[PDB]
Design a binder for this molecule. Sequence first.
Ligand SMILES: Oc1ccc(-c2c3cccc(C(F)(F)F)c3nn2Cc2ccccc2)c(O)c1
Lengths: 10, 234
Amino acid sequence: HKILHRLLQD
Amino acid sequence: KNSLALSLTADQMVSALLDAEPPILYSEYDPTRPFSEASMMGLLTNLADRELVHMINWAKRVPGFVDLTLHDQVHLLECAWLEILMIGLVWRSMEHPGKLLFAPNLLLDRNQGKCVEGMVEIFDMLLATSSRFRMMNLQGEEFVCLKSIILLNSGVYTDHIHRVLDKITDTLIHLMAKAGLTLQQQHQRLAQLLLILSHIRHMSNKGMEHLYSMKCKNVVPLSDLLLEMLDAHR
Ligand SMILES: Oc1ccc(-c2c3cccc(C(F)(F)F)c3nn2Cc2ccccc2)c(O)c1
Protein backbone atom coordinates (compact mmCIF):
# COMPACT_ATOMS: atom_id res chain seq x y z
CA HIS A 1 0.00 0.00 0.00
CA LYS A 2 3.11 2.19 -0.10
CA ILE A 3 3.43 4.53 -3.08
CA LEU A 4 7.08 3.47 -3.14
CA HIS A 5 5.96 -0.13 -3.71
CA ARG A 6 4.22 1.03 -6.87
CA LEU A 7 6.91 3.42 -8.18
CA LEU A 8 9.66 0.81 -7.83
CA GLN A 9 7.68 -1.46 -10.19
CA ASP A 10 6.88 1.15 -12.85
CA LYS B 1 21.25 -16.45 -9.22
CA ASN B 2 24.51 -14.62 -9.93
CA SER B 3 24.16 -10.83 -10.12
CA LEU B 4 25.23 -9.05 -13.31
CA ALA B 5 26.69 -6.31 -11.09
CA LEU B 6 29.73 -8.33 -9.99
CA SER B 7 30.66 -9.23 -13.57
CA LEU B 8 31.10 -5.58 -14.55
CA THR B 9 34.55 -4.13 -15.06
CA ALA B 10 35.47 -0.98 -13.12
CA ASP B 11 35.08 1.21 -16.20
CA GLN B 12 31.73 -0.45 -16.90
CA MET B 13 30.53 0.17 -13.35
CA VAL B 14 31.56 3.80 -13.72
CA SER B 15 29.75 4.12 -17.07
CA ALA B 16 26.61 2.53 -15.65
CA LEU B 17 26.53 4.98 -12.74
CA LEU B 18 27.29 8.06 -14.83
CA ASP B 19 24.54 7.05 -17.24
CA ALA B 20 22.07 6.52 -14.37
CA GLU B 21 22.54 10.08 -13.07
CA PRO B 22 19.27 11.98 -12.58
CA PRO B 23 19.14 15.45 -14.16
CA ILE B 24 19.43 18.73 -12.29
CA LEU B 25 15.88 19.98 -11.78
CA TYR B 26 14.86 23.64 -11.69
CA SER B 27 12.75 25.39 -9.05
CA GLU B 28 9.82 27.67 -9.95
CA TYR B 29 10.75 30.62 -12.18
CA ASP B 30 9.65 33.16 -9.55
CA PRO B 31 12.80 35.21 -8.76
CA THR B 32 11.61 36.10 -5.26
CA ARG B 33 14.37 35.15 -2.82
CA PRO B 34 12.67 33.06 -0.11
CA PHE B 35 12.90 34.67 3.34
CA SER B 36 10.31 32.76 5.32
CA GLU B 37 9.56 29.23 6.46
CA ALA B 38 6.59 29.09 4.09
CA SER B 39 8.46 30.28 1.00
CA MET B 40 11.66 28.30 1.56
CA MET B 41 10.09 25.01 2.68
CA GLY B 42 7.49 25.38 -0.04
CA LEU B 43 10.20 25.41 -2.70
CA LEU B 44 12.31 22.71 -0.97
CA THR B 45 9.32 20.37 -0.72
CA ASN B 46 8.31 20.76 -4.36
CA LEU B 47 11.88 20.14 -5.50
CA ALA B 48 12.35 17.15 -3.20
CA ASP B 49 9.05 15.73 -4.39
CA ARG B 50 10.14 15.79 -8.04
CA GLU B 51 13.69 14.65 -7.30
CA LEU B 52 12.29 11.59 -5.52
CA VAL B 53 10.73 10.29 -8.73
CA HIS B 54 14.09 10.60 -10.52
CA MET B 55 15.84 9.05 -7.51
CA ILE B 56 13.61 6.00 -7.59
CA ASN B 57 14.35 5.41 -11.25
CA TRP B 58 18.04 6.10 -10.62
CA ALA B 59 18.25 3.49 -7.86
CA LYS B 60 16.86 0.82 -10.21
CA ARG B 61 19.82 1.55 -12.46
CA VAL B 62 22.48 1.10 -9.77
CA PRO B 63 24.11 -2.30 -10.48
CA GLY B 64 22.95 -4.86 -7.91
CA PHE B 65 19.94 -2.88 -6.68
CA VAL B 66 17.69 -4.69 -9.16
CA ASP B 67 18.75 -8.08 -7.74
CA LEU B 68 17.24 -7.14 -4.39
CA THR B 69 13.69 -8.13 -3.42
CA LEU B 70 11.16 -5.30 -3.77
CA HIS B 71 10.91 -5.05 0.03
CA ASP B 72 14.66 -4.64 0.36
CA GLN B 73 14.73 -1.95 -2.32
CA VAL B 74 11.96 -0.10 -0.46
CA HIS B 75 13.81 -0.33 2.84
CA LEU B 76 17.08 0.95 1.32
CA LEU B 77 15.35 3.91 -0.34
CA GLU B 78 13.37 4.73 2.81
CA CYS B 79 16.55 4.76 4.90
CA ALA B 80 18.68 6.64 2.39
CA TRP B 81 16.52 9.16 0.53
CA LEU B 82 17.48 12.25 2.55
CA GLU B 83 21.19 11.38 2.57
CA ILE B 84 20.93 11.04 -1.23
CA LEU B 85 19.10 14.35 -1.70
CA MET B 86 21.64 16.02 0.56
CA ILE B 87 24.83 14.65 -1.01
CA GLY B 88 23.39 15.67 -4.37
CA LEU B 89 22.82 19.19 -3.02
CA VAL B 90 26.36 19.33 -1.62
CA TRP B 91 27.78 18.10 -4.93
CA ARG B 92 25.82 20.73 -6.92
CA SER B 93 26.96 23.46 -4.51
CA MET B 94 30.68 22.68 -4.76
CA GLU B 95 31.57 25.44 -7.19
CA HIS B 96 29.52 27.91 -5.15
CA PRO B 97 31.38 28.59 -1.87
CA GLY B 98 29.00 29.85 0.83
CA LYS B 99 25.99 28.92 -1.28
CA LEU B 100 23.64 25.96 -1.49
CA LEU B 101 22.54 25.31 -5.08
CA PHE B 102 19.15 23.68 -4.52
CA ALA B 103 18.59 24.34 -8.22
CA PRO B 104 20.34 26.41 -10.89
CA ASN B 105 17.66 29.06 -10.29
CA LEU B 106 17.62 28.61 -6.53
CA LEU B 107 20.73 29.39 -4.48
CA LEU B 108 20.23 29.83 -0.74
CA ASP B 109 22.72 31.27 1.74
CA ARG B 110 22.96 30.78 5.49
CA ASN B 111 21.22 34.11 6.06
CA GLN B 112 18.17 32.48 4.48
CA GLY B 113 18.57 29.32 6.54
CA LYS B 114 18.10 31.55 9.59
CA CYS B 115 14.51 32.01 8.37
CA VAL B 116 13.65 28.58 9.74
CA GLU B 117 14.16 27.82 13.42
CA GLY B 118 16.80 25.09 13.47
CA MET B 119 17.69 25.31 9.79
CA VAL B 120 20.87 27.41 9.81
CA GLU B 121 22.75 24.66 11.71
CA ILE B 122 21.90 22.17 8.99
CA PHE B 123 22.75 24.72 6.30
CA ASP B 124 26.14 25.27 7.94
CA MET B 125 26.73 21.49 8.01
CA LEU B 126 25.88 21.20 4.32
CA LEU B 127 28.11 24.15 3.39
CA ALA B 128 31.04 22.73 5.37
CA THR B 129 30.53 19.44 3.47
CA SER B 130 30.47 21.18 0.10
CA SER B 131 33.62 23.08 1.04
CA ARG B 132 35.22 19.77 2.03
CA PHE B 133 34.31 18.21 -1.32
CA ARG B 134 35.74 21.23 -3.09
CA MET B 135 39.07 21.29 -1.26
CA MET B 136 39.35 17.55 -1.92
CA ASN B 137 38.67 18.17 -5.60
CA LEU B 138 35.98 15.46 -5.57
CA GLN B 139 35.37 14.10 -9.07
CA GLY B 140 32.03 13.29 -10.71
CA GLU B 141 32.98 9.61 -11.04
CA GLU B 142 33.81 9.57 -7.34
CA PHE B 143 30.56 11.30 -6.47
CA VAL B 144 28.40 8.68 -8.21
CA CYS B 145 30.26 5.86 -6.43
CA LEU B 146 29.64 7.56 -3.07
CA LYS B 147 25.94 8.08 -3.76
CA SER B 148 25.59 4.41 -4.69
CA ILE B 149 27.37 3.38 -1.47
CA ILE B 150 24.87 5.40 0.59
CA LEU B 151 21.98 3.71 -1.20
CA LEU B 152 23.33 0.24 -0.43
CA ASN B 153 24.90 0.83 2.98
CA SER B 154 22.53 2.94 5.00
CA GLY B 155 19.72 0.44 5.56
CA VAL B 156 21.90 -2.68 5.26
CA TYR B 157 22.05 -3.33 9.03
CA THR B 158 18.31 -2.90 9.58
CA ASP B 159 25.78 -10.72 1.58
CA HIS B 160 24.94 -9.68 -1.99
CA ILE B 161 24.83 -6.05 -0.90
CA HIS B 162 28.22 -6.40 0.76
CA ARG B 163 29.79 -7.91 -2.36
CA VAL B 164 28.37 -5.06 -4.41
CA LEU B 165 29.78 -2.60 -1.87
CA ASP B 166 33.22 -4.17 -2.24
CA LYS B 167 32.83 -3.89 -6.02
CA ILE B 168 32.18 -0.17 -5.58
CA THR B 169 35.25 0.12 -3.34
CA ASP B 170 37.28 -1.55 -6.12
CA THR B 171 35.83 1.04 -8.53
CA LEU B 172 36.73 4.02 -6.31
CA ILE B 173 40.33 2.74 -6.09
CA HIS B 174 40.39 2.13 -9.85
CA LEU B 175 39.42 5.79 -10.33
CA MET B 176 42.17 7.10 -8.06
CA ALA B 177 44.76 4.86 -9.68
CA LYS B 178 43.50 6.01 -13.09
CA ALA B 179 44.05 9.57 -11.84
CA GLY B 180 47.66 8.75 -10.92
CA LEU B 181 47.43 8.65 -7.12
CA THR B 182 50.10 6.66 -5.27
CA LEU B 183 49.05 3.64 -3.20
CA GLN B 184 49.22 5.60 0.05
CA GLN B 185 47.22 8.44 -1.52
CA GLN B 186 44.56 5.98 -2.67
CA HIS B 187 43.86 4.47 0.76
CA GLN B 188 44.00 7.88 2.44
CA ARG B 189 41.54 9.41 -0.09
CA LEU B 190 39.27 6.37 0.18
CA ALA B 191 39.23 6.83 3.95
CA GLN B 192 38.58 10.58 3.68
CA LEU B 193 35.68 10.12 1.29
CA LEU B 194 34.08 7.39 3.37
CA LEU B 195 34.38 9.37 6.60
CA ILE B 196 32.32 12.14 5.03
CA LEU B 197 29.52 9.58 4.71
CA SER B 198 29.30 9.62 8.51
CA HIS B 199 28.61 13.34 8.41
CA ILE B 200 26.13 12.92 5.57
CA ARG B 201 24.34 10.37 7.79
CA HIS B 202 24.38 12.86 10.65
CA MET B 203 22.90 15.61 8.49
CA SER B 204 20.14 13.28 7.30
CA ASN B 205 19.23 12.32 10.87
CA LYS B 206 19.06 15.94 12.04
CA GLY B 207 17.14 16.95 8.93
CA MET B 208 14.67 14.14 9.45
CA GLU B 209 13.99 15.46 12.97
CA HIS B 210 13.40 18.88 11.48
CA LEU B 211 11.01 17.60 8.79
CA TYR B 212 8.98 15.65 11.35
CA SER B 213 8.73 18.87 13.32
CA MET B 214 7.55 20.74 10.21
CA LYS B 215 5.19 17.87 9.42
CA CYS B 216 3.57 18.28 12.83
CA LYS B 217 3.44 22.09 12.43
CA ASN B 218 1.41 21.37 9.31
CA VAL B 219 1.57 24.52 7.18
CA VAL B 220 4.05 23.44 4.52
CA PRO B 221 2.16 20.90 2.40
CA LEU B 222 3.72 17.45 2.23
CA SER B 223 2.97 15.04 -0.57
CA ASP B 224 1.75 11.56 0.33
CA LEU B 225 5.04 10.22 -1.06
CA LEU B 226 7.15 12.51 1.11
CA LEU B 227 4.96 11.65 4.12
CA GLU B 228 5.49 7.93 3.59
CA MET B 229 9.25 8.40 3.15
CA LEU B 230 9.27 10.44 6.35
CA ASP B 231 7.00 8.10 8.30
CA ALA B 232 9.44 5.26 7.54
CA HIS B 233 11.88 6.88 9.96
CA ARG B 234 9.12 6.66 12.57
O1 LIG C 1 17.63 18.63 -3.82
C1 LIG C 1 17.30 18.73 -2.43
C2 LIG C 1 18.30 18.44 -1.44
C3 LIG C 1 17.94 18.55 -0.01
C4 LIG C 1 16.58 18.97 0.36
C5 LIG C 1 16.23 19.06 1.82
C6 LIG C 1 16.93 19.87 2.87
C7 LIG C 1 18.14 20.81 2.87
C8 LIG C 1 18.56 21.45 4.12
C9 LIG C 1 17.82 21.18 5.38
C10 LIG C 1 16.62 20.25 5.36
C11 LIG C 1 15.74 19.87 6.65
F1 LIG C 1 14.43 20.34 6.47
F2 LIG C 1 15.70 18.48 6.74
F3 LIG C 1 16.32 20.41 7.74
C12 LIG C 1 16.20 19.61 4.12
N1 LIG C 1 15.11 18.69 3.87
N2 LIG C 1 15.15 18.36 2.44
C13 LIG C 1 14.20 17.45 1.75
C14 LIG C 1 12.72 18.00 2.03
C15 LIG C 1 12.51 19.46 2.15
C16 LIG C 1 11.16 19.98 2.41
C17 LIG C 1 10.04 19.04 2.55
C18 LIG C 1 10.26 17.59 2.44
C19 LIG C 1 11.61 17.07 2.18
C20 LIG C 1 15.59 19.25 -0.61
O2 LIG C 1 14.27 19.65 -0.21
C21 LIG C 1 15.94 19.14 -2.04
